[PDB]
Amino acid sequence: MQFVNKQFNYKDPVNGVDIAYIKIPQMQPVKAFKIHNKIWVIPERDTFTNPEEGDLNPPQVPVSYYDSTYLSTDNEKDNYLKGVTKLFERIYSTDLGRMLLTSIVRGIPFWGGSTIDTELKVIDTNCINVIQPDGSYRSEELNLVIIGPSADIIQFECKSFGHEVLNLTRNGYGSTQYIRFSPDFTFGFEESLEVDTNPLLGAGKFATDPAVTLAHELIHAGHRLYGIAINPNRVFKVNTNAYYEMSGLEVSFEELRTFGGHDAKFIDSLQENEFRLYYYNKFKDIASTLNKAKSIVGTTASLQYMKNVFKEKYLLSEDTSGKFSVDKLKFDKLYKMLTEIYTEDNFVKFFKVLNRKTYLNFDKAVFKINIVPKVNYTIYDGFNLRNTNLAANFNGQNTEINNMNFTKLKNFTGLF
User: Fold this and answer.
1) Pair 321, 160: CB distance under 8 Å
2) Phi then psi dihedrals of residue 132, to 5 deg
3) Burial level of 203, CB count in 10 A (0-12/13-18/19+)?
4) Can you give the residue ranges of the Botulinum/Tetanus toxin catalytic chain domain (predicted)?
């Protein structure tokens, strides 16, 4: 059962519904594709979300790649759409990916826009403006947008619009997430840990499966949609890699969490418990706010429907009178799902790929790839195609054996 019911072509005609020109919250409209309920793809470079990041030229840090022309042509946009779609299908074909994507679709950003306690209202920056067939705009709520990268092509990241006083990614509310991502490039890493974590060694023999990379960003998006991301000011001042220490490199707890495995264990039990309590408190604030709302703002959804949406998102308890409360057992279960079950390391296990063993490494290279052709990459096997030489030993990821699938654009080793 597929996650994306239409195999869109970039040149398919607009219909104002799932193929439309849109604006995000001056810009010109951009052509976008609704691949699933609450999820859109915009095959454009992101010159929109951040005013200080309005062009595509270099300002270069070792791990960066610039090409102002990437993702400018219709064929590239067609391949971007197809590649992103394939990666969603690869994710969804795993039990873990289906779980994550279900959580994402259910994670409607909270209707926290009212400054009148007795009214419940959407936040406008959790919507896009869609051009209808008559040329006028309508507002559509959504959870997730996949967009092309900004100037640095390989700076993938999950970001979102803020609110003037609310901290939407950290107060339980959540916000629509924009993931800067490309399926057209991937990183090289080294198979020996002592090489991978050394900035002076290795050329990047193995290629990361982009499905893992997209999953990583989706995991961030899950955290942010549920308003449980850890403040990026909470960091591990890394003291387990001499090279990290020499450069003072700090890694956010949020990244370590998302990677999972042993990386997540650098967050100690006391800090885990602190965050769990902090976010529990946020879910309690949400239940209280829902209970104060006696009317909805707008005409599109009933108060009782939206209260049900948020009951299902946050797994709230509802008494007969209609009062919500947070069950600490269900909260802990959901919080654990989002933070410990949905991890990069767990995805690696479901995809049966080779991958970096830790976030605390040094990237070796970037490669240009093309995952669209089935002769190159499949939903079911990634690069490691069954019943071929590429099936065994992650040979499909081995850039020296499957060399036709990778062209090295830049070496990072030596530049750190």
Assistant:
1) no
2) -85, 170
3) middle
4) 4-403
Q: Cα dist. 216→187, 315, 415 in Å? A: 14, 24, 25
> Rounded to an integer, what distance in angstroms lies between the CA atom of residue 326 and that of residue 339?
18
Q: Are 376 and 383 in contact (CB under 8 A)?
A: yes
Helix (H, G, I), strand (E, B) or coil at 323: coil
Does residue 41 contact residue 81 with C-beta atoms inside 8 Å? Answer: yes
Ramachandran category for residue 325: left, alpha or beta (phi over 0 → left; psi -120 to 50 → alpha): beta
Resolution in Å, one decimal place? 1.2
Domain CATH code at residue 45: 3.90.1240.10
Domain that holds residue 339: 1-416
> What's the number of domains the chain is made of?
1
- Backbone φ/ψ region at 382: left (φ over 0), alpha (ψ -120 to 50), beta: left
3-state DSSP assignment of residue 157: strand
What amino acid positions are annotated as catalytic residues?
217
Which residues, other chains included, contact 356 with Cβ-Cβ below 8 Å and sequence gap of 6+? 189, 196, 208
What is the β-pairing status of strands 39-45 and 144-148? parallel
